[PDB]
Write a protein that binds this ligand. Structure first.
Ligand SMILES: CC1(C)S[C@@H]2[C@H](NC(=O)CCC[C@H](N)C(=O)O)C(=O)N2[C@H]1C(=O)O
Ligand SMILES: [Fe+3]
Length: 328
């Protein structure tokens, strides 16, 4: 098993006004997106140590009672409005992973998409403030911190594709973004149940089988335990861990709109018996967002691919990933 080339890219110019320096970042994004599909964003300005510490405190103090109270409908039939946001329970002896997903904090009963009951929009559910002091405040602020990083990364991606820097980011707005944060706990277990370990075709023991991300891009923090692998023509390659940076990759919406020029890399999760964290931010656009596809390989840039509304893409995509990879 070889090692994936995952370059560290200083993205700090994307927050500034030095346009040539932005173009040099964009070139690095282009190169990584055309190679393995992954890079590490460094000098991102987010306190990822606090993120890991607050997430750990939550994961390790939430009780079985609180997990039922917050559970998505896959685990609690009383919560039919919770398809996305809420707690995803572990099943001791069967399913090791557990997680907590939340959406746009601006999705409230006042929001017209909530009033209209549009699919993929939900009001976040939260534990008791007194039992989890500061957790909701931290989690909402983290959403906006990583939103700000993601907006800048989208400027880099736009420039990399020869577009104006707001080509993607203009569709990424606090008032309607369908972006999500997921706080995933992968536990240490002794004994680790074999029922929670899948075996790949090539013999590798996995926690999560191959998939493409349902996103425009994915902005991922992981603790310092190597686990991820990216598929290449020569087979799967290990992505080295870095708990100070963000692992960035394109999702299938980006592959669609670039005519596969920037592929959505196929990746999977090796089984590792180690307590660790996987904290993705899925950069999703608004429900009605449509980006006209193009092909940077053709002089005219023309693509035959149909424009796709993001909301319908996201609804279809999240159902599909459950069916193939299983309920997480
Ligand atoms: C490889 C990943 C980072 S991505 C992969 C997998 N992804 C998902 O389940 C999509 C979650 C979507 C979310 N509930 C929403 O409504 O927006 C997961 O979890 N996996 C992570 C993992 O196992 O670390
Ligand atoms: Fe993924």
């Amino acid at each position: 098993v070889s090692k994936a080339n995952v370059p560290k890219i200083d993205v700090s110019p994307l927050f500034g006004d030095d346009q040539a320096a932005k173009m040099r970042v964009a070139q690095q994004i282009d190169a990584a997106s055309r190679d393995t599909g992954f890079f590490y964003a460094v000098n991102h300005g987010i306190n990822v140590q606090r993120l890991s510490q607050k997430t750990k405190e939550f994961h390790m103090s939430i009780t079985p009672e609180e997990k039922w109270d917050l559970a998505i409908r896959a685990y609690n039939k009383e919560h039919q409005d919770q398809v996305r946001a809420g707690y995803y329970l572990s099943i001791p002896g069967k399913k090791a992973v557990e997680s907590f997903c939340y959406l746009n904090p601006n999705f409230t009963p006042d929001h017209p998409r909530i009033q209209a009951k549009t699919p993929t929009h939900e009001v976040n559910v939260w534990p008791d403030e007194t039992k989890h002091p500061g957790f909701q405040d931290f989690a909402e602020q983290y959403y906006w911190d990583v939103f700000g990083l993601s907006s800048a990364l989208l400027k880099g991606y736009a420039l990399a594709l020869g577009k104006e820097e707001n080509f993607f980011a203009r569709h990424f707005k606090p008032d309607d973004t369908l972006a999500s944060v997921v706080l995933i706990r992968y536990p240490y277990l002794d004994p680790y149940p074999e029922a929670a370990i899948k075996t790949a075709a090539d013999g590798t023991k996995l926690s999560f089988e191959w998939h493409e991300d349902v996103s425009l891009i994915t902005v991922l923090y992981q603790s310092n335990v190597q686990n991820l692998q990216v598929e290449t023509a020569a087979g799967y390659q290990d992505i080295e861990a870095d708990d100070t940076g963000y692992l960035i990759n394109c999702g299938s919406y980006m592959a669609h709109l670039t005519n596969n020029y920037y592929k959505a890399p196929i990746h999977r999760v090796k089984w590792v018996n180690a307590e660790r964290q996987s904290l993705p931010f899925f950069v999703n656009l608004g429900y009605d967002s449509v980006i006209d596809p193009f092909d940077p390989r053709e002089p005219n840039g023309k693509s035959d691919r149909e424009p796709l509304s993001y909301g319908d893409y996201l609804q279809n995509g999240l159902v599909s990933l459950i069916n193939k990879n299983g309920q997480t």
